[PDB]
Amino acid sequence: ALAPEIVGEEHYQVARKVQQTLQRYKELQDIIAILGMDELSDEDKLVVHRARRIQFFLSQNFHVAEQFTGQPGSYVPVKETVRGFKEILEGKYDHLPEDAFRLVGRIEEVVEKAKAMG
Amino acid sequence: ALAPEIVGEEHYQVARKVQQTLQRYKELQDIIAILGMDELSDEDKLVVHRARRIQFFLSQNFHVAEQFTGQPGSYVPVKETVRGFKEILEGKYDHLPEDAFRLVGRIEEVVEKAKAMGV
Amino acid sequence: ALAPEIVGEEHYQVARKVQQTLQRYKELQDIIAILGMDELSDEDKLVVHRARRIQFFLSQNFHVAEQFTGQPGSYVPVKETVRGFKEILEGKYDHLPEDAFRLVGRIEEVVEKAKAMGV
Amino acid sequence: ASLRDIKTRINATKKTSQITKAMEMVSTSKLNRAEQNAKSFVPYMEKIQEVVANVALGAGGASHPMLVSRPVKKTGYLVITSDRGLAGAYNSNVLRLVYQTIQKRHASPDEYAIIVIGRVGLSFFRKRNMPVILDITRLPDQPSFADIKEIARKTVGLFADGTFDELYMYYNHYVSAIQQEVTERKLLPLTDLAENKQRTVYEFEPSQEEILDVLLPQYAESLIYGALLDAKASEHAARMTAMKNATDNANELIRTLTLSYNRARQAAITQEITEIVAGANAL
Amino acid sequence: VAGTLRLDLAAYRELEAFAQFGSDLDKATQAKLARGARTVEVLKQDLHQPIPVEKQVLIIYALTRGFLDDIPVEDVRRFEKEFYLFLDQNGQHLLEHIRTTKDLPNEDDLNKAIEAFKKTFVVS
Amino acid sequence: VAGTLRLDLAAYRELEAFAQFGSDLDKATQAKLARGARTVEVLKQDLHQPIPVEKQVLIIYALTRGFLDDIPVEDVRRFEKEFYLFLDQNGQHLLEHIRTTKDLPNEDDLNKAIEAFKKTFVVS
């Protein structure tokens, strides 16, 4: 179903960009292991900075996971998650800590978690 | 019919030498498959160099194949074939590129098309 | 019957060490056949060095094997073979050629057969 | 091919792939160390170049700075090679260039000699009919100046002694992890220097003849040292690239062999079940 | 202790084949290599000699907390064999606590007992 | 115009493999790589959008005669689209000649039309 004819041009582009960024991060894993992250070029470090946040934002708090975590669950619309991932890709939240993306619903919940963390 | 008393002594010797070089190349292909040609000794590198050119010169352009590729075909006498393969075995044309040996007839066409390309 | 209480602790340990050395050697052949012995570490080089000698010393000449070997056979007791394999594991005869261990019986015959080659 | 043979091939190729991947990682680490050593060597070269430029515009009566110290005669060749293979065309390119040059311009065994670093060069020139006078084989992965200063001193002293009247050095130059360029440099006699802040160096100006007797051999020794860091970096990069290529080839071969093994397994099951049913219904 | 043991064994089994090139000390991965080698030495066992669960827990705790990091792999079997006797001589309180409450004793007491045994264990 | 494209695409596909391994490729190899990349770009197509053979002939002619050599690779599809629009706008005579005669029109006229379109085309 991930085709622009039926899922939408914006959705398709955002998904492809996310997959490309994660593939680049996966490629950089061995060099990140062998040498410090500083050795990477500024572009590669920016790529890793985006990719870690995207990887954490892919997680979600489930309704049935309350028995494990105490916290409630979330139901995220597809348009909401597309807008959130687009904003993340555009660098809107590069200054936020990577742990604010850990387990949330909407993109606004990342901002709320960061504000609570201080 | 591949017997010295049927095809001739030099014909038989050239055929046997070609088969020997091709067998050696087939044996080496396993090593070239993984680690390339860098670790081969100077003898094996020369064997590969000769074998690739022999294998490419074994190709020919056919009259019937003119409908598929627009090139006209060729008819090669057995004496010319023996002379060409003996010359290739002797190392006369080691400096020519290996792509100049493809789909030609007599050994002179190899030189002609090598001259047509950069040389 | 290969148990410490059945055959003895020293025999059990030397047999287990021989088996471990041979098992280690078997894995190294796959990478040796491609990358050569030069890329092996100093430990693995010694492992191969001793394992080849152990494997060659595992050979023997049988009395009924005269028809096939010319040389007569031998009878090696268990204490003597355990002692010889212990010495080879300890590395007393690393300087001996590996061919000196072929169908020899005891290590005494190994060191005497080495004299025939000038070692 | 049988299932046993295919399985053995697959296992051997997997082991080789793992070994090559580990070698590639080690070579990457060594390349980084070589690069930082080459970075560290810069200030010594800068200061010695500045000093020599400041005092090489003087009377220059020494043998070394002469444009032609002695006429055409025996020529010394310095070559830098590795001690082990698996580096790709690293040794082959340099040896090919050296052989072509000495065949094209010398054409006589009496007028050329080879100074060789690395055992593969020894093997090459010994297999050929080549006279080699100075040898050095073992050398650390991160070489130091004092490691082969003892052979650099002999190399400069041979020119100072009149054994040969010309010096050339051939080595691989490190441009990138993929690019290694074979470089020829005219070593001796000294020919030219830089052009900035002229004369600053000769304020003290102690006697020139005595100072040049020691300053020059030092510049040559620094030149041989600069050539070894670049050679080591190029060797490490070439090893890394070759091991990466070998690992990729091994992975592709593993994939193809696995496909063939699965097809053979399916065919064997088909044959056994067909024979079973034919025998069962033949009654 | 099983969670740490599993991760150590996995990080040894993968990242294995670097041992030969890890002989040339690189990256401090040799720490993981040594921990994995000692874990493999600990997991070995003989015939018809089952170990009580409390002693298994104690030896795995000693391994996973780094008390074996300076004992060479050649001496791990002797360390365990003598540590069991030291336990049944001077750690009856810990053994009884484990057997009764099904839980680990105080980490301070565990460290005290392990250090007391380790100062008496002679390395050879 | 088709024979050059067919053999080139088959070979370019194997020369790119050498390009991926990394080598100091010559100028002829660089030109072959550029032409192969542009051929791969022009041979792509979208769903349910068939193209008339007359337009296909012109686009392949423009590819083969080097008129696309100075166009960046990422702009090839846009160049083809805008070229089709410009053809519908101005090259009715060439299109009708091809439809009627099943043969190429004047090569000078084709060159003039392509070089006229290239002026209105915008890079990047």
- DSSP states of A47-90 as a string? HHHHHHHHHHHT----STTHHHHSS------HHHHHHHHHHHHT
Of residues D18, D19, D29, nearest to E26 (C-beta): D29
Closest alpha carbon to D167 in D141, D192, D191, D195: D191
Alpha carbon separation from B71 to B74, B78, B111, E52, E78 (Å, rounded): 10, 22, 17, 85, 82
Round to whole Å and give the CA distance between A87 and A15.
Answer: 13
Judge: E17–D19 Cβ closer than 8 Å, yes or no. yes
Chains C and A touch (3+ CB pairs under 8 A): no
Closest alpha carbon to C109 in C49, C68, C56, C65: C56
**Shortest CA gap E79–chain D (Å):** 33
Give alpha helix (H) positions in chain F: 2-21, 27-42, 53-64, 76-90, 92-101, 107-120
C-chain residues near B34 (CB < 8 A): 34
Which contiguous run of DSSP H or E holds residue B19?
helix B9-35
Choosing among B32, B35, B42, which should be mutated to test the D contact, i.e. which has the most D CBs within 10 A? B35
Assigned token pair, D135: 């040898």
Contact C110/C100 with Cβ under 8 angstroms? yes
Please give the radius of gyration of chain E, using alpha carbons only, rounded to the nearest integer. Answer: 15
Q: Which residue of B has its CA nearest to C33?
A: B31
Contact E63/E38 with Cβ under 8 angstroms? yes
Contact B88/B54 with Cβ under 8 angstroms? yes
Which contiguous run of DSSP H or E holds residue B113?
helix B107-116
Phi, psi (deg, nearest 5) at residue D281: -90, 0
Closest alpha carbon to D129 in D101, D103, D92: D103
Round to whole Å and give the CA distance between D252 and B34.
Answer: 10
Assigned token pair, D175: 């441009």
Which contiguous run of DSSP H or E holds residue F47?
none
Round to whole Å and give the CA distance between F95 and F81.
Answer: 16
Burial-class residue D95 by CB neighbours within 10 Å (0-12, 13-18, 19+): buried
Phi, psi (deg, nearest 5) at residue C102: -85, 115
- DSSP states of F68-102 as a string? TTTS-GGGHHHHHHHHHHHHHHH-HHHHHHHHHHS
Judge: E17–D29 Cβ closer than 8 Å, yes or no. no
Assigned token pair, A15: 């998904």
List Cβ<8 Å contacts ≥24 apart for D6-9.
D6/D257, D6/D260, D6/D261, D6/D264, D7/D261, D9/D257
Contact A87/A107 with Cβ under 8 angstroms? yes
CATH class assigned to C7-117: mainly alpha
**Chain A: touching chains (3 or more CB pairs < 8 Å):** D
D-chain residues near B33 (CB < 8 A): 249, 253
Q: Which residue of C has its CA nearest to D23?
A: C39
Closest alpha carbon to F62 in F122, F123, F116, F7: F116
Partnered with residue C65 across adjacent β-strands are none
Q: Does C30 touch chain D (CB under 8 A)?
A: yes
**Shortest CA gap C27–chain B (Å):** 19
Chains F and E touch (3+ CB pairs under 8 A): no
Round to whole Å and give the CA distance between D58 and D48.
Answer: 16
Round to whole Å and give the CA distance between E16 and D22.
Answer: 10
Domain extents in chain A: 9-117
Choosing among D23, D24, D25, which should be mutated to test the E contact, i.e. which has the most E CBs within 10 A? D25
Please give the radius of gyration of chain F, using alpha carbons only, rounded to the nearest integer. Answer: 16
Contact D120/D85 with Cβ under 8 angstroms? yes
Beta-carbon contacts of E19 under 8 Å, excluding residues fewer than 6 positions away, are E33
Q: Which residue of A has its CA nearest to D26?
A: A34
Round to whole Å and give the CA distance between B34 and D253.
Answer: 8
Closest alpha carbon to C52 in C13, C73, C24, C11: C24
Q: How many CB atoms lie within 10 A of CB C93?
A: 19
Which contiguous run of DSSP H or E holds residue E53?
helix E53-64
Contact C82/C97 with Cβ under 8 angstroms? no
Q: Which residue of C has its CA nearest to E18?
A: C41
Q: Which residue has the tokens 């030397």?
A: C14
Closest alpha carbon to E73 in E111, E26, E123: E123
Contact E68/E38 with Cβ under 8 angstroms? yes
Contact D175/D86 with Cβ under 8 angstroms? no
Closest alpha carbon to D57 in D205, D218, D223: D205
List Cβ<8 Å contacts ≥24 apart for B95-100.
B96/B53, B98/B52, B98/B53, B98/B56, B99/B56
- DSSP states of chain C as a string? --SHHHH-HHHHHHHHHHHHHHHHHHHHHHHHHHH-GGGS-HHHHHHHHHHHHHHHHT----GGGHHHHSS------HHHHHHHHHHHHHTTTTTS-GGGGTT-SSHHHHHHHHHHTT-
Residue D8 identity (one-letter amino acid): T
- Those residues of chain C whose CB sits closer than 8 Å to some CB in chain B are 34
Burial-class residue D152 by CB neighbours within 10 Å (0-12, 13-18, 19+): buried
Contact F35/F8 with Cβ under 8 angstroms? yes
Round to whole Å and give the CA distance between B32 and B97.
Answer: 20
- Using the Cα atoms of residue C81, residue C86, residue C92 and residue C96 in order, give the sign of their dihedral: positive
Alpha carbon separation from D91 to A93, B38, B53 (Å, rounded): 51, 10, 26
Chains C and F touch (3+ CB pairs under 8 A): no
Q: Does A34 touch chain D (CB under 8 A)?
A: yes
For E107-120, give one letter per residue: b (16+ CB within 10 A) or e. Answer: eeebeebbeebbee
- Those residues of chain E whose CB sits closer than 8 Å to some CB in chain C are 20-21, 23
Residue E117 identity (one-letter amino acid): F
Assigned token pair, A53: 């946040």
Contact A10/A77 with Cβ under 8 angstroms? no
- Those residues of chain D whose CB sits closer than 8 Å to some CB in chain E are 18-19, 22-23, 25-26, 29
Assigned token pair, B73: 């075909």
**Shortest CA gap D3–chain E (Å):** 26
* CATH architecture group of domain A9-117: Orthogonal Bundle (1.10)
Q: Does B30 touch chain D (CB under 8 A)?
A: no
Round to whole Å and give the CA distance between E45 and E29.
Answer: 27
Q: Does B108 touch chain D (CB under 8 A)?
A: no
> What DSSP designation does B108 have?
H
- Using the Cα atoms of residue D107, residue D113, residue D115 and residue D119 in order, give the sign of their dihedral: positive
Q: For residue D223, how many C-alpha atoms fall within 13 Å in the half-sphere facing its CB?
A: 24
Helix, strand or coil for residue E52? coil
Beta-carbon contacts of D129 under 8 Å, excluding residues fewer than 6 positions away, are D109
Contact C110/C57 with Cβ under 8 angstroms? yes
Assigned token pair, F73: 């690779």
Helix axes D42-55, D3-40, angle to 10 degrees: 50
Of residues B33, B39, B42, nearest to D85 (C-beta): B39
- Those residues of chain D whose CB sits closer than 8 Å to some CB in chain B are 13, 16, 85-89, 92, 127, 242, 245-246, 249-250, 253
Phi, psi (deg, nearest 5) at residue D58: -85, -165
Contact D67/D189 with Cβ under 8 angstroms? yes
Judge: D23–E21 Cβ closer than 8 Å, yes or no. yes
Assigned token pair, E119: 């100062």
Q: Tell me which fold the domain B9-116 belongs to.
A: 1.10.1140
Helix axes D208-281, B9-35, angle to 10 degrees: 100
Round to whole Å and give the CA distance between B48 and F26.
Answer: 23
**Shortest CA gap E71–chain D (Å):** 28
D-chain residues near A31 (CB < 8 A): 28
Contact A50/A85 with Cβ under 8 angstroms? no
Q: How many CB atoms lie within 10 A of CB D121?
A: 26
Alpha carbon separation from E14 to D29, E10, E36 (Å, rounded): 20, 6, 10
Assigned token pair, F105: 């029109």
Round to whole Å and give the CA distance between F113 and F73.
Answer: 22
Choosing among D90, D245, D254, D256, which should be mutated to test the B contact, i.e. which has the most B CBs within 10 A? D245
Pairing of strands D167-174, D132-136: unpaired
Residue B88 identity (one-letter amino acid): I
Assigned token pair, D283: 């009654």
**Chain F: touching chains (3 or more CB pairs < 8 Å):** D
Contact E118/E80 with Cβ under 8 angstroms? no
Closest alpha carbon to D245 in D257, D237, D255: D237
C-chain residues near D20 (CB < 8 A): 35
**How many interchain CB pairs under 8 A, D with F?**
5
Judge: B33–D88 Cβ closer than 8 Å, yes or no. no
Round to whole Å and give the CA distance between F109 and F112.
Answer: 5
D-chain residues near E24 (CB < 8 A): 26
Judge: B38–D89 Cβ closer than 8 Å, yes or no. yes
Q: Does C40 touch chain E (CB under 8 A)?
A: yes
**Helix, strand, coil proportions of chain E in percent (round to 5)?**
70, 0, 30
Partnered with residue D247 across adjacent β-strands are none
Q: Which residue has the tokens 């309180």?
A: E93
Judge: D16–C30 Cβ closer than 8 Å, yes or no. yes
Round to whole Å and give the CA distance between B105 and B79.
Answer: 13
Round to whole Å and give the CA distance between B81 and B59.
Answer: 12
Round to whole Å and give the CA distance between B59 and F84.
Answer: 43
Assigned token pair, F45: 């197509």
Closest alpha carbon to D82 in D128, D129, D131, D138: D138
List Cβ<8 Å contacts ≥24 apart for F9-12.
F9/F36, F9/F39, F9/F40, F9/F43, F11/F36, F12/F36, F12/F37, F12/F39, F12/F40
Indicate the Cα dihedral angle F31, F32, F37, F42, nearest 10°: 100
Contact C35/C44 with Cβ under 8 angstroms? no
Q: How many CB atoms lie within 10 A of CB F58?
A: 24
> Listing from the earlier edge strand, what are the strands of the sheet with D180-188?
D132-136, D112-117, D75-80, D167-174, D180-188
**Shortest CA gap B99–chain D (Å):** 22
Please give the radius of gyration of chain A, using alpha carbons only, rounded to the nearest integer. Answer: 16
Round to whole Å and give the CA distance between A108 and A89.
Answer: 15
Closest alpha carbon to E103 in E114, E111, E94, E112: E94
Q: Is the peptide bond before B77 cis (omega within 30 degrees of 0)?
A: no
Contact D82/D232 with Cβ under 8 angstroms? no
Q: How long a stretch of residues is chain B?
A: 119
Judge: B39–D86 Cβ closer than 8 Å, yes or no. yes
Assigned token pair, F83: 């070229």
D-chain residues near F21 (CB < 8 A): 245
Assigned token pair, D187: 């070593």
Helix axes F53-64, F27-42, angle to 10 degrees: 170
Residue E89 identity (one-letter amino acid): Q
- Using the Cα atoms of residue A47, residue A50, residue A53 and residue A54 in order, give the sign of their dihedral: negative
Chains E and B touch (3+ CB pairs under 8 A): no
Judge: C31–D19 Cβ closer than 8 Å, yes or no. yes
Please check whether the domain covering D22-241 is classified as CATH 3.40.1380.10. Answer: yes
**Shortest CA gap B77–chain D (Å):** 39
Assigned token pair, D142: 């991160």
Of residues D85, D89, D249, nearest to B33 (C-beta): D249
C-chain residues near E21 (CB < 8 A): 41
Judge: D19–C27 Cβ closer than 8 Å, yes or no. no
**Chain C: touching chains (3 or more CB pairs < 8 Å):** B, D, E
Beta-carbon contacts of A69 under 8 Å, excluding residues fewer than 6 positions away, are A61, A103
Three-state SS annotation for chain D? CCHHHHHHHHHHHHHHHHHHHHHHHHHHHHHHHHHHHHHHCHHHHHHHHHHHHHHCCCCCCCCCCCCCCCCCCCEEEEEECCCCCCCCCHHHHHHHHHHHHHHHHCCCHHHEEEEEECHHHHHHHHHCCCCEEEEECCCCCCCCHHHHHHHHHHHHHHHHCCCCCCEEEEEEEECCCCCEEEEEEEEECCCCCCCCCCCHHHHCCCCHHHHHHHHHHHHHHHHHHHHHHHHHHHHHHHHHHHHHHHHHHHHHHHHHHHHHHHHHHHHHHHHHHHHHHHHHHCC
